[PDB]
Write a protein that binds this ligand. Sequence first.
Ligand SMILES: [Mg+2]
Ligand SMILES: [Mg+2]
Ligand SMILES: [Mg+2]
Ligand SMILES: [Mg+2]
Ligand SMILES: [Mg+2]
Lengths: 177, 136, 84, 104
Amino acid sequence: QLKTKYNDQVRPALMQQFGYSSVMAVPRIEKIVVNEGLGSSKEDSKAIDKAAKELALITLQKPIITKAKKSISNFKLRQGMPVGIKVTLRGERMYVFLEKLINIGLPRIRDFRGINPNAFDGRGNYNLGIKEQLIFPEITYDMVDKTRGMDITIVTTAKTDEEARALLQSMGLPFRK
Amino acid sequence: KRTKFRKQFRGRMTGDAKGGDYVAFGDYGLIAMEPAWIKSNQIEACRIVMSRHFRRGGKIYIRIFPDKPVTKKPAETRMGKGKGAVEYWVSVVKPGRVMFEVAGVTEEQAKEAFRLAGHKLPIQTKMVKREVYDEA
Amino acid sequence: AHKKGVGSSKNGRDSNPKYLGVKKFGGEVVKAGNILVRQRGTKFKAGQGVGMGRDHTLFALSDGKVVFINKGKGARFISIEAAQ
Amino acid sequence: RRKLRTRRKVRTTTAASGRLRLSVYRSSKHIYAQIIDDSRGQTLAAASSAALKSGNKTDTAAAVGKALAAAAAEKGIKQVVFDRGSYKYHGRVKALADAAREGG
RNA sequence: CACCCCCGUGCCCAUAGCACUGUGGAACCACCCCACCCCAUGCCGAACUGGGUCGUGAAACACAGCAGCGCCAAUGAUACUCGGACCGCAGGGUCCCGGAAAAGUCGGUCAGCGCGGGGGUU
RNA sequence: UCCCAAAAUGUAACGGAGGCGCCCAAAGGUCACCUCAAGACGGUUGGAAAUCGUCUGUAGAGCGCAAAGGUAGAAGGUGGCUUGACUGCGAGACUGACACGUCGAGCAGGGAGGAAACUCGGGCUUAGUGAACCGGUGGUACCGUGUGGAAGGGCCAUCG
RNA sequence: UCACAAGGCUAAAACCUUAUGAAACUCCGAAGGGGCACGCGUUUAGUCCGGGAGUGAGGCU
Ligand SMILES: [Mg+2]
Ligand SMILES: [Mg+2]
Ligand SMILES: [Mg+2]
Ligand SMILES: [Mg+2]
Ligand SMILES: [Mg+2]
C-alpha cells in the first residue's frame, strides 16, 4: 500500500518545484513517533494496560512504557514509576498508520479545518497535535473505558521547514488557510 | 556592604595589589597607598560623604567590596571553641588598588569629595585620572 | 531527659591518620611486586608490565627499571623496561 | 555506537598477551582480515576479497578465513587473538574465525 | 617512498579539533533494497543481523581550500623565590646574588611519521 | 573525607567543615549491549522542570550513603548465564614503636561466564570496627593420670 | 564552584561588554623540596650484633 504515489506525484514534482540534482537529496519520511503521555493525574495500575490495548490496535505494534526520569521535585515527582507510553513506527507500519490517518483519521475529526502550518521543528521536522481519541478507525467507545487524547511526530530528511511543509502538502495534508 | 551567603569564617596574610586598574568606569579615582582591612561601615561612610557632596548624580563607583568575615571576644574566655562570625566584614586592600572612582563631576568637585572620604579611611591615599590602557 | 538535641551542633576534633603518594620513581631498579604508587583514583594508569590492585595501587609484575609516561597530563602511565 | 570498536580493541590487552591481533572489516562485502603484531606498527599476514571473490560476497565467509589461516601458516603464525569492529560474532564474521580455527 | 588514490589499522590524543565554501563515484566506501528464517530490538530490522542489484553520492565518509572560533604560543619586563644581608613598634617592606612564572602581546598552525592489502597512469 | 599542612611523606590546638558503627543474592563474577545533566524550537494530560521529537551537548550528569581523588574506550545505565562474597598457599613490597592494617604476581585442587585472548579469592577506591581471657555450636579423633574406654582438654570453623 | 562591581539586554535565569575576591576555587604554575643512579669528585661517617643508659616539663628569636 502507498509508497509509489509518494514517488510519482511528489519525487519528480519536487525536483521541478525546487532544483534537486539527485533523487536522494529529495526529502523523505524517516519515522512517525506516537507518544502517549498519561500518568501524573492518571496514576493507575489499570490505565497502563488500557492504553496498550488502544495503541496495539491502531498501530499494530507493542508499546514501550517510558518510565519517569527519576526526578524528585516539590510536586508529584519520584523515581522509576510508569508514566508515559511510546510507539515508534517505520516503513510499512508507518505507512499503514499514516494512510489510516489522511484518508480515515484526519477527515473523521470533529471541529476539523486542518492542522497548524507554521514552522515547527526549525530543522525541517513536523509535530502533530491530536486533542482527542474518539476520531480514529479502530478507536470506538464500544470496547473502551473512558476518553483521552494523544501526540504524534513526523521525522523528515528535509533540511528546512520550507522543504518539509511542501513534502507534507503534496503527500496529502489539511492546512487552515 | 555584607555578602548574601558563603562558608562562615576565614584567616589572614599580605603582599602588593593584584587586580586594580586606575581608569575604567570613571574619570577620577582614589588609590590606597598602605595595606589594610577596609570595614563595611568604613566604605558606607565614604559613599555617604561623597554622595552628599555631589547631591544629585550618584556617579560614584565603589570598586572594593567586604568579602571577608572577622570574629570577636564574647566577654573574656579562651577555655572553649572558635569565635563569633558576626563582628565585621572586610575588604583586603593592598597599595595600588582603586577603591573609588567618580564620573561627570569637575576636577575640584572631585579633589574635595575624595579629600573628605580620605578622612573616613584607616590609610594614606591619593587622587588619580587618565592614561591607563592595559585592556578596554 | 530534656527536649534539646542528643548531638550538640558545631564541632572540629574530627580527622583521620591518613597515608598515600608515589613509592618508586622514574629510574629505579624494582623487584617484582614492589609498589610504585598509592592513589585514590587513576592519577597514574597501569602501563606495560605493571598491575593495578583493588585500591588502584600500582605494583610491578617483573623486575626492571621504572619509566614514567606523562601523556600531555590527564593520562599517566608507569611501566617497566628491564635491564636484562 | 563507534565506542564498540574502541571497547573491543582496548579489551584486547595488547603486548601483555604476547599474541598477535586479527582485525576484520566485515562492514562491507570486502574484508581485510589482517594479522597485526602488537609491538611493531606492522601487519604480518592479511587476506581480502576485493580482487577476486568468485561471485560470493557474504558466502565467501569461510573462504577468506581459510585463505588467511593458510596465508599465516606459511610465516609460522600460530598464536593469535581476534578483534571485531562492532561485529556481533555470528555470520560473515563468525565464519572467518571458524574457518581459521579449523584451517590451522 | 615509481607517481597518485582508496579501504583497513597504527604511533601520535588539538600546532592533530569545529564550523563555513568545494571537489569525489561506478575502483573502494556509504546509504539504498527487500528480510520469512540464523540472530536481534524492555516498542519498532533506526540499531545489531541476513540476502543483493540498480539508483544516488543526497546524508555519512575521504580529500582540498580558508585563520571566523577554538588550540599552541615567544622575546622583553614583572610577580614570586633558594641563598646572602637589612629596615620598621607593627601591618609590612628593602638591597645584593642566582632560579624564574602566570596572564597578555609578537607570532604559529585547517598536522606529522608508519605497516598491510585494493584500484588506476588506453 | 576536606582545609589548616609551609607543591615528597608526616605534623598540633576546647582551629574551620562534614560523615560512619552500614547497606546489596544482586548493588557480586562474567559475557553482551547502551551513553549523560541542561538549554533552545515544536508539539495531547500539561503549561516552571515534565512523557515525546529533532539540533546543540568531555561531562556542566551518574557512581547506595560524607567528602576528596577518579571515572563515558566506563567505574555510569540494561540483560543472559552464574556463584571466585572459593579451599590450600603466598615471590615481593607498602605502612606502623610494637600489636595491627593494606596491595599482591604466581602455584595447586575444584569450578563460573565466554567462541576465544582471558577474567573472577566481593563491591570505583578511601569509613561500616573490637586484643586477649572465659564460654556456646558444628567438625576432627591429637592428649587422656596402671590399661582399654569414657568425662575433660587440644586442633580447624565459627557465634557472644 | 561560591561570592561579587558599572552597564547592555529580556518576560528576573541565561547571555554580552567592562571589573574583582577566594583556607576548604583552580585553565596555569615557580623558587624550593623529596626518591633513585652516578661519583667527573672533596670529605669522612654509616650499617649490623650485643652490655649499660639517661631523656619522654623545654625556652627564646
Ligand atoms: Mg593560553
Ligand atoms: Mg644564590
Ligand atoms: Mg631571604
Ligand atoms: Mg626587627
Ligand atoms: Mg632577581
